[PDB]
Structure 1
Amino acid sequence: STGSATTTPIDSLDDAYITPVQIGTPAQTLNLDFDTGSSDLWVFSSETTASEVDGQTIYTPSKSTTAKLLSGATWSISYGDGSSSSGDVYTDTVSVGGLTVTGQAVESAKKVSSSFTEDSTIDGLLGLAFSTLNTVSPTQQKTFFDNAKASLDSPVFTADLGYHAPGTYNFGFIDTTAYTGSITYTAVSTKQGFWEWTSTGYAVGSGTFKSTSIDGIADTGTTLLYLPATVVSAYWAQVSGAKSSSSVGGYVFPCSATLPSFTFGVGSARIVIPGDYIDFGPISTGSSSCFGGIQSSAGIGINIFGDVALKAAFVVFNGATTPTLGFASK
C-alpha cells in the first residue's frame, strides 16, 4: 500500500505545516502537524478542557463506531519549546492520504498548554520519530508509520515541504518526479529515538565548504535550523547589522538585508538553502528587525535540521531494518 497527502504551511512564515488526517468511522478529519522529532499521535478532542480549546477541530471518540478506549493508558509529553499536552488513549482507524491503519493509538488530550490553545490551525500532532520515544504508559504505543510499515510497498516515507507553499508527505514509495539529481543516503542512529544523522559540513553564501561533522536530527516539527554556535556565528557575520539578541531569543537582522544562502553537506552531496528561506520576518508587526531562520543549538543539547533545512530538499525517511535518511535537491 501507499499514501500521499498534501501538507500546508499554517501561516505566511511557514511556522509549521498541517496535513489532513482521517480518524474514526465515519471519518473525522483533523489537521495534524507531522513531527519527525516525536512519536505520539495526539489530538484535541471532546475530552480537552474547554477553556484550552480555541478554534481547533476536535476528535470525538464517542461518535466513532471503531473507537475503543485503551483502558488505563495515559500519555504526557513536552516539546522543545516548553509546550506540553497530556491525556488518555483510544485506538481507532487512522488514514493519511489513502493509507489506513486500523487500531492506531490516538492520544486524546485532556490538557494542552497555552501555545497549543493559541494555535487554532493545529488540531494535534502525528509523530514520525521512532516508537521508542512514544509516551503512552503503561503500554508504549507505535507510531502511524511503524504500524503501517509492514503493509507499505517500501518501508519509507518522504517529506517534500514547500517554501511559502504546500508540499507533500508520501508513505511507501519514492516519487522520482519530485526531486532533481540523485538522492544521497546517509546513516541514521536510532539510539536517542530520532532520525539522527551526521552532516559533513557547511558553506555560507558563495564561500568555500567547511568539512566538519555536525550530528543532528531531521525534524519536520521544528521550524528553524539549529546548529552549533560556531557555525551560526559564521553565517550571521556575513549579514551587516545581524546580532544575537538575548531579549528576542536569538539572532535578528535588519529587515533591509538580503540574506546569503546556507549549504549543508550530506555525504559528498550538498543541499543549498536559499537566503530567503532564512528570513522569518519582523520580530513584531511593523518592526524593522527580522528574526533569523538559523539559530544556535547551544542549550538545546542537539542540532536540529528543522523545516528551514528540510524544505530545501526532498527527504527520504527510510525505515528499513537499517534506517537511513536520503536527501535530494529539488
Structure 2
Amino acid sequence: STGSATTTPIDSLDDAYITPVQIGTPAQTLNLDFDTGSSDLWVFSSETTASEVDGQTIYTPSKSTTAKLLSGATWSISYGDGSSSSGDVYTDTVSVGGLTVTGQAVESAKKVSSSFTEDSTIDGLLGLAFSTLNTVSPTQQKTFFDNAKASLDSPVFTADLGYHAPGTYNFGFIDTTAYTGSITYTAVSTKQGFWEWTSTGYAVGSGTFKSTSIDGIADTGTTLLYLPATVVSAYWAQVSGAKSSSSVGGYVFPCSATLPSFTFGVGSARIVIPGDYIDFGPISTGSSSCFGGIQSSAGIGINIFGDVALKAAFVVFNGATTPTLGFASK
C-alpha cells in the first residue's frame, strides 16, 4: 500500500504545515501537524476543555462507529516551545492520503496549552519520530508510520515541504519525479527516539565549505533551523546590522537586508537553503526588524534541522530495520 497527502502552510511565513487526516467512521477530517520530532497522534476533541478550543475542528469519538476507548490509557506531552497537551486515548481507523491504519491510537486532548488554543489552524499533531517516545501510559502506543509499515510497499515516508507553497508527504514509495539529481543517504541514531543524523558541515553564502560534524534531528514540527552558536554567528556576521536580541529571543536583522544562502552537508552532497527561506518577517507588525530563520541551539541541548532546512530538500525517512535519512535537492 501507499499514501500521498498534500501539506499546506498555516500562514504566509510557513510557521507550520497542516495535512488533512481522516479519523473514524464516517470520516472526520482534521488538519494535523505532521511532526518527525514527536511520537503521539493527538487531536482536539469533544473532550477538550471548552475554553481551550478556539476555532479548531474536533474529533468526536462518540460519532465514530469504529472508535473504542483504550481503557485506562492516558497521555501527556510537552514540546520544545513550552507547549503541552494531555488526555485519554481511543483506538480508531486513521487514513492519510488513501493509506488506512485500523486500531491506531488517537490521543484525545482534555487539556491543551495556550499556544495550541491560539492556533485555530492546527487540529492536532501526528508524530513520526520513533514509537519509543510515545507518551501513552501504561501501554505505550505505536505511531501511524510504525502501524502502517508492514503494509507499505517500502518502509519509508518522504517529506517534500514547500517554500510559501504546499508540498507533499508520501508513505510507502519514493516519487523519483519530486527531486533532482540523486538522494544521498546518511546514518540515523535512534538512541534518543529521533531521526538523528550528522551533517558534514556548512557554508554561508558563496563562502568556503567548513567540514565539521553537526549532530542534529530532522524535525518537521520545528519551524526554524537551530545550530551551534559558532555556526549561527558566522551566518549572521554576513548580514549588516544583524544582532542577537535577548528582548526578542534570537537573531534579528534589518528588513532592508538581502540574506545570504546557507548550505549544509549530507555526506559529500550539499543542500542549499536560499536566503529568502531564512526571512521570518517583522518581529511585530510594522517593525523594520525582522526575525531570522537560523537561530542558536545553545539553550536547547540538540541541533534541529527544522522546516527552514527541510523545505530546501526532498527528505526520505527510511524506516527499514536499520533506519537512514536521505536528502536530495529539488
- Shorter-chain TM-score tier: over 0.9
Aligned to 2:139, the other structure's residue is in SS state coil
**How many Å apart are 1:303 and its aligned residue?**
0.1
CA deviation profile, 1:46-77 (whole Å, cap 9, x unmatched) = 00000000000000000000000000000000
Separation in structure 1 between the aligned mates of residue 43 and residue 184 of structure 2, nearest angstrom: 35
In structure 1, the residue corresponding to 2:300 is in which secondary structure?
Answer: coil
The CA deviation string for residues 240-268 of structure 1, in whole angstroms up to 9 with x for no partner, is 00000000000000000000000000000
CA distance in structure 1 between the partners assigned to 2:91 and 2:15 by the alignment: 30
Tell me how far apart the structure 1 counterparts of residues 81 and 248 of structure 2 sit (CA, whole Å). Answer: 14
> Structure 1 CA distance, aligned partners of 2:85 and 2:22?
21
SS at match of 1:116: helix
Superposition deviation, residue 209 in structure 1: 0.1
Cα-to-partner distance string for 1:164-190 (whole Å, 9 max, x where unaligned): 000000000000000000000000000
Query: 1:70 aligns to what SS in structure 2?
Result: strand
The residue matched to 1:291 in structure 2 has which SS?
Answer: strand
Aligned partners of 1:179, 1:288: CA distance in 2, in Å?
A: 36
Cα deviation digits, residues 208-239 of structure 1 (max 9, x gap): 00000000000000000000000000000000
Displacement after TM superposition at 1:152 (Å):
0.1
Shift of 1:286: 0.2
CA deviation string 1:260-300 (max 9, x = no partner): 00000000000000000000000000000000000000010
For the residues of structure 2 that align with 1:287 and 1:317, how far apart are their CA atoms?
A: 39
Which residue in 1 is equivalent to 2:23?
A: 23
3-state DSSP class of the match of 1:147? helix
Aligned to 1:257: 257
Structure 1 residues not aligned, in runs of 5+:
none
Q: Report what 2:82 is aligned to.
A: 82
- What does the per-residue CA deviation read over 1:71-109, in whole Å, with 9 as the maximum and x for residues that have no partner? 000000000000000000000000000000000000000
C-alpha distance in 2 between matches for 1:240 and 1:175? 41
What are the residue-to-residue correspondences of 1:164-203 with 2, within 5 Å? 164-203=164-203
Q: By how many angstroms is 1:149 displaced?
A: 0.2
Over 4 Å off, 4+ runs: none
Task: Give the TM-score of the pair, scaled to structure 2.
Answer: 1.00
Deviations 1:101-135 (A, max 9, x none): 00000000000000000000000000000000000
Shift of 1:301: 0.2
Normalised TM-score (structure 1): 1.00
The alignment-based identity, stated in percent, is 100
The aligned residue for residue 123 of structure 1 is 123
Q: Distance in 2 between matches of 1:273 and 1:299?
A: 23
Q: How many residues align?
A: 330
CA distance in 1, matches of 2:246, 2:101: 45
* Rounded Cα–Cα distance in structure 1 between residues aligned with 2:38 and 2:61: 23
Instruction: Provide the aligned C-alpha RMSD in A.
Output: 0.1
Cα distance, 1:321 vs structure 2: 0.2
Indicate yes or no: 2:312 matched with 1:312. yes
Whole-angstrom distance in 2 between the partners of 1:247 and 1:155 = 45
Which SS does the other structure have where 1:141 is aligned? Answer: coil
Aligned to 2:68: 68
3-state SS of paired residue (2:203)? strand
Distance in 2 (alpha carbons) for counterparts of 1:158 and 1:285: 35
Distance in 2, matches of 1:199 and 1:30, equals 35
Q: SS of the residue aligned with 1:132?
A: helix
Q: Deviations over 1:122-170 (max 9, x none)?
A: 0000000000000000000000000000000000000000000000000
Structure 1: how far apart are the matches of 2:247 and 2:75?
34
For structure 2, which runs of at least 5 residues remain unmatched after alignment? none
CA distance in 1, matches of 2:280, 2:183: 28
Partner Cα distance (2:63, 2:10) in 1:
27
Give me the whole-angstrom Cα distance separating, in 2, the residues matched to 1:219 and 1:51: 30
Separation (CA, whole Å) in 2 of partners of 1:317 and 1:249: 31
Q: For the residues of structure 2 that align with 1:131 and 1:253, how far apart are their CA atoms?
A: 39
